Design a protein around this ligand. Sequence first.
Ligand code: NAP
Ligand code: GYI
Length: 167
Amino acid sequence: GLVPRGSHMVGLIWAQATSGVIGRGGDIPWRLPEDQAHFREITMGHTIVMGRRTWDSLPAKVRPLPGRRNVVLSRQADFMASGAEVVGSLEEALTSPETWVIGGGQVYALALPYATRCEVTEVDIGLPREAGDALAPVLDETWRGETGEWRFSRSGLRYRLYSYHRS
Ligand SMILES: NC(=O)c1ccc[n+]([C@@H]2O[C@H](COP(=O)([O-])OP(=O)(O)OC[C@H]3O[C@@H](n4cnc5c(N)ncnc54)[C@H](OP(=O)(O)O)[C@@H]3O)[C@@H](O)[C@H]2O)c1
Ligand SMILES: CCc1nc(N)nc(N)c1OCCCOc1ccccc1CCC(=O)NS(=O)(=O)C(C)C
């Protein structure tokens, strides 16, 4: 369904291990180049919102992510995010008709109450939760959606896509 341009659709998009781990040591603890393709089709041409630590985790070669208005949340007024914009709270981050929150753990939790879509790649990797891990947000019972089929990446890693939505 098309988004009426006067509304404010907020989506979250992330990839997680079975356990819910999404981040560890300032990085994503797997590599799934196939997952980048879905990430691009979902986010291209819209505003993307990320926490400062996720900005730090982006490779300099793709930073800011092209074709998208990059917004970084930080409480550091002097933060340097070249080619992006830095806002100090959530309200000014979510002003676009369509916004995709692209991480990390803190900012997913912050934005979830306002979101009506989650695009979730589940990676079949057994990484138990560890102290300091960044984690996927917990979805309450208002969400619903579709579970995709498992597929192998070129590397042999198995993954599948969940598309969740709510009113
Ligand atoms: N698997 C995935 O799909 C995926 C996607 C993205 C990221 N990641 C990984 O997730 C990890 C990063 O997640 P994280 O939870 O540690 O950090 P994060 O959510 O990316 O960023 C946290 C930072 O955002 C700022 N912030 C948080 N709440 C704010 C608020 N209400 N107002 C203003 N600023 C706020 C603060 O920046 P300041 O400290 O500068 O004040 C805070 O330190 C990394 O490991 C990353 O590689 C994984
Ligand atoms: C792709 C990981 C990911 N997957 C999902 N499903 N949701 C996320 N929020 C997520 O993290 C998005 C932020 C982390 O992004 C990373 C991390 C490592 C290497 C490169 C990057 C840039 C991403 C990139 O290359 N994007 S792209 O549009 O293909 C164009 C910039 C090449």
